[PDB]
């Protein structure tokens, strides 16, 4: 016994994760607190390694050293799994042979009372024959995973070492790494919550409480309620940013102002650096992002009729539907239209107004040139990225874009469309919901691909069909002037108008490059030129 | 015993006689499979437009047999794979399934592993 019976984890670094210490301890090293003696007569081995998994950044490096602070071990071993690789031929193994050197020599010299060595491993997927069945060439010379477990076991009994591995994709480790005798105990270490923000937060500003350097506006709880799906690291990077920004401004106002000495000895950070840091400086990875929705929302939602309140009401009810619901925690709709009607704002407002904690936005604007077999893998990170969070938003953007279409022939790409029929009928882990908007113009095709089976719903969204909509819609736009808005009345009276929003914008732009006079024959022209008939 | 709470997501309710007659054709596959000398393996196909509750079923009918080996292949947990890793992945599952005295496999979604699509039609032979 080396530890106090029930331990202690708090103000000593690691602050967010207190009930995982007391999980570990009981399922692995019940063996080394009990005494001695008994552990001897029963005659029982000790676990020789542990894994953990989760998100980067979350704190996994803190809990392995504190492990092998608490049983009194020598220096941890660290190293790194990309490091631990070279193209020369019967060189990886040789890098994997070097780490248990010192082990093998304590136990021959001092026998059966040695220490205890620990090697923490990070990135311990990247050797593994397991990725390559994945579209790939990543085959690893399979040969070293062998060597690290002849090391771990064997006809040579290594009795006094402990092997802490950690990843971040749990299903590409080699599952002969699992069996009993080798890594035999797994753990999670996912996203913090209310309370371990809060603490965090604690924890990262305890020094200028000290020295009465932060201000007494600024509060904690605030900050810890603000910041939604925040991990570890984005929070200290938030304090340094706040601390940088204080500085800045606090040099900038002294000289531009000969302030007294008794304004410029103090440098209160105040809670006004705190708030622009957060809203300008800190980008997170797993939370909403407000910049790039006005990426796509360009001129806003302007309310011409009653489809688009239909529209926005069923998504509504979806969401309801989606949010606090049993026996059906996934559920997925589609919008379908004629091409400029405006389809992709519409998706981004339903996704917007949902208030979830993490939305996204897959489209393939970021996909020029990439193999289809790249695309698999993007749109498969995006999904396993969002189901790590209790409530999550999806949008594909344009799904005729993804499978490569083309007319003629018919063409495209086969393994994208399986992979999304695959992903679309896939709930998430226990206790997690989801929801997916689609985007297309193309509605025959996919119904005749036996896509449209699985989708759950589906909406119109029509075009402008009457005159008096037109007109609306330029008065709420105003770019017209009165008489010209009677005149445009009067030619358009006719009632044969069929136009998109973003059609009718271009026009509008278009038509506005001459002098006054001539404005409303050239707009005129061109809306007659454009005279569909469904 | 994680996979058949799995997909048995919400039990199984007695609506009409159907499902007494499946489940009565499945034991009856049990038993002669178990009992037999002439004829070791044996095969069966559940066939029903979508959305009719095929898995379900199945599972019900491997769960019950109280055999020492069950198995379980869907498409779902090979997303992105290409053909070859697939046929590895399915040789490795019988090849585990052969060691055993007693041994039952469920293969799911026959037309996903195939990649069907009418269009075509394009599939992996
Ligand atoms: N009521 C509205 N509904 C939709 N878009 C609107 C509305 N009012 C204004 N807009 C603007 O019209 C444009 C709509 O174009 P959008 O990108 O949504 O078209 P789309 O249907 O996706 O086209 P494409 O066929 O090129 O994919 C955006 O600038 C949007 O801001
Ligand atoms: N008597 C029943 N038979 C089948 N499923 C039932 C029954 N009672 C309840 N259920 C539930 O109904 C759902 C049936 O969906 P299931 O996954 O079996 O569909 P499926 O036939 O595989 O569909 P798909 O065509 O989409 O592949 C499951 O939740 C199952 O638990
Ligand atoms: N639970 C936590 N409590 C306090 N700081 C944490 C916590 N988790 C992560 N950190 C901070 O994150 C950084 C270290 O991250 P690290 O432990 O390497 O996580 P990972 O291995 O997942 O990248 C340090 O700034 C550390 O203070
Ligand atoms: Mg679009
Ligand atoms: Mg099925």
Redesign the pocket.
């Known amino acids: 016994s080396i530890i106090n019976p029930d331990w202690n984890f708090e103000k000593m670094?690691?602050?967010?994760?207190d009930k995982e210490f007391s999980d570990i301890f009981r399922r692995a090293f019940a063996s080394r607190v009990f005494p001695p003696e008994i552990v001897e007569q029963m005659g029982c081995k000790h676990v020789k390694g542990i894994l953990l998994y989760g998100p980067?950044?979350?704190?996994?490096?803190?809990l392995a050293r504190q492990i092998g602070k608490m049983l009194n071990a020598r220096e941890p071993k660290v190293v790194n799994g990309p490091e631990i690789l070279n193209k020369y031929v019967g060189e990886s193994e040789a890098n994997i042979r070097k780490l248990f050197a010192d082990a093998e020599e304590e136990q021959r010299r001092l026998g059966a009372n040695s220490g205890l060595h620990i090697i923490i491993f990070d990135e311990i997927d990247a050797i593994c024959k397991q990725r390559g069945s994945m579209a790939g060439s990543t085959g690893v010379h399979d040969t070293v995973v062998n060597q690290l477990l002849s090391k771990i076991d064997g006809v040579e009994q290594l009795n006094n070492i402990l092997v802490i591995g950690?990843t971040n994709r749990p299903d590409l480790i080699d599952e002969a790494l699992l069996r009993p005798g080798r890594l035999e105990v797994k753990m999670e270490i996912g996203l913090?919550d209310e309370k371990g923000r809060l603490q965090?937060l604690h924890?990262h500003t305890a020094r200028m409480r000290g020295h009465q350097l932060l201000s007494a506006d600024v509060d904690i709880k605030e900050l810890a309620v603000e910041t939604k799906n925040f991990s570890?690291?984005e929070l200290?990077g938030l304090v340094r940013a706040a601390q940088s920004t204080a500085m800045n401004r606090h040099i900038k106002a002294s000289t531009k102002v000969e302030v007294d000495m008794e304004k410029a000895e103090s440098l209160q950070v105040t809670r006004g650096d705190f708030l622009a840091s957060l809203e300008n400086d800190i980008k997170p990875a797993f939370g909403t992002n407000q910049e790039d929705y006005a990426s796509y929302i360009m001129n806003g939602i302007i309310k011409w009729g009653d489809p688009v309140t239909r529209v926005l009401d069923d998504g509504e009810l979806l969401v309801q539907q989606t949010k606090n619901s049993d026996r059906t925690p996934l559920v997925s709709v589609l919008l379908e239209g004629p091409p400029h009607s405006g389809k992709t704002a519409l998706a981004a407002k339903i996704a917007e107004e949902s208030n979830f904690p993490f939305i996204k936005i897959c489209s393939p604007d970021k996909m020029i040139g990439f193999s289809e077999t790249a695309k698999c893998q993007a749109m498969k990170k995006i999904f396993d990225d969002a189901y790590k969070s209790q409530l999550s938003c999806v949008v594909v953007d344009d799904i005729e874009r993804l499978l490569d279409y083309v007319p003629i022939g018919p063409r495209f790409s086969n393994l994208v469309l399986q992979a999304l029929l695959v992903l679309l009928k896939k709930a998430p882990p226990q206790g997690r919901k989801l929801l997916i908007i689609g985007t297309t113009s193309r509605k025959d095709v996919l119904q005749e691909m036996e896509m449209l089976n699985a989708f759950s719903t589906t909406i119109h969204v029509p075009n402008i069909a009457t005159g008096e909509q037109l007109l609306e819609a330029l008065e709420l736009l105003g770019n017209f002037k009165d008489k010209e808005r009677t005149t445009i009345a009067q030619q358009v009276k006719g009632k044969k108008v069929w136009i998109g929003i973003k059609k009718l914008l271009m026009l509008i732009e278009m038509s506005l490059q001459m002098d006054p006079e001539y404005r409303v024959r050239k707009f005129l022209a061109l809306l007659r030129e454009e005279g569909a008939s469904p």
């Not at 670094?13 to 994760?17: A, E, F, N, T």
């Open positions: 670094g690691i602050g967010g994760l980067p950044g979350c704190g996994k490096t803190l950690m913090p965090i924890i570890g690291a200290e």
